[PDB]
């Protein structure tokens, strides 16, 4: 009875957050994703 | 001499279980809403 009385209609939201926000990310450590993974294709075992 | 004899010993009387009296009719509440349609509500209410 608690389930049939107090179940409510959902309000759906479809949000598309691509990873073009690493350029936007935190404004102190920002980077371009495709350029940096091109940098990570060689010179293994590093980190930015 | 004269003789004495008791006349008509009284039989006891009938009782009954008069613990049933007036009924106080209880009222009914009001269900607000449900977002489910009628067949699922019948399929649950019949089992209840």
Strands of chain A, count: 0
- Radius of gyration of chain A equals 21 Å
What profile does the largest beta sheet of chain A have? none
Assembly level: part of a larger assembly
What percentage of amino acids of chain A are in beta strands?
under 5%
- Helix content class of chain A: 25-40%
The helix-strand sequence of chain A is: HH
Report the principal-axis shape of chain A.
elongated
Terminal CA distance of chain A reads: 55 Å
Structure classification of chain A: mainly alpha
The biggest chain-chain interface is: A-B, 5 and 7 residues
Number of DSSP helical runs of chain A: 2
PDB class: toxin
Keywords: Toxin, membrane permeation, translocation, complex
Entry title: Cryo-EM structure of Yersinia pseudotuberculosis TcaA-TcaB
Chains A, B: Toxin,Toxin complex subunit TcaB,Putative toxin subunit,Putative toxin subunit,Toxin,Toxin complex subunit TcaB,Putative toxin subunit,Putative toxin subunit,Toxin,Toxin complex subunit TcaB,Putative toxin subunit,Putative toxin subunit,Toxin,Toxin complex subunit TcaB,Putative toxin subunit,Putative toxin subunit
